[PDB]
Amino acid sequence: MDETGKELVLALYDYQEKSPREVTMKKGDILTLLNSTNKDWWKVEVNDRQGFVPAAYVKKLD
């Protein structure tokens, strides 16, 4: 990754939230990446909903 500023992730998988700290993302959704302190769990935002999802289901742009 570079200093591109607004870094987003591409949801390449349909991932339905089970836990309240998860968020619903579907294949094709482009979500805002707001936390990557965990290399297994990333905080993504869809519209106005944030949650932690396994990074293996999303693709990092840049």
UniProtKB/Swiss-Prot annotation:
It is found in: Cytoplasm, Cytoskeleton; Cytoplasm, Cell cortex. It comes from the Eukaryota. Residues 4-62 form the SH3 domain. Signal peptide: none annotated. Morphologically, spectrin-like proteins appear to be related to spectrin, showing a flexible rod-like structure. They can bind actin but seem to differ in their calmodulin-binding activity. In nonerythroid tissues, spectrins, in association with some other proteins, may play an important role in membrane organization. Belongs to the spectrin family. Like erythrocyte spectrin, the spectrin-like proteins are capable of forming dimers which can further associate to tetramers. Interacts with ACP1. This is Spectrin alpha chain, non-erythrocytic 1. It comes from Gallus gallus (Chicken). The lineage of its organism: Eukaryota, Metazoa, Chordata, Craniata, Vertebrata.
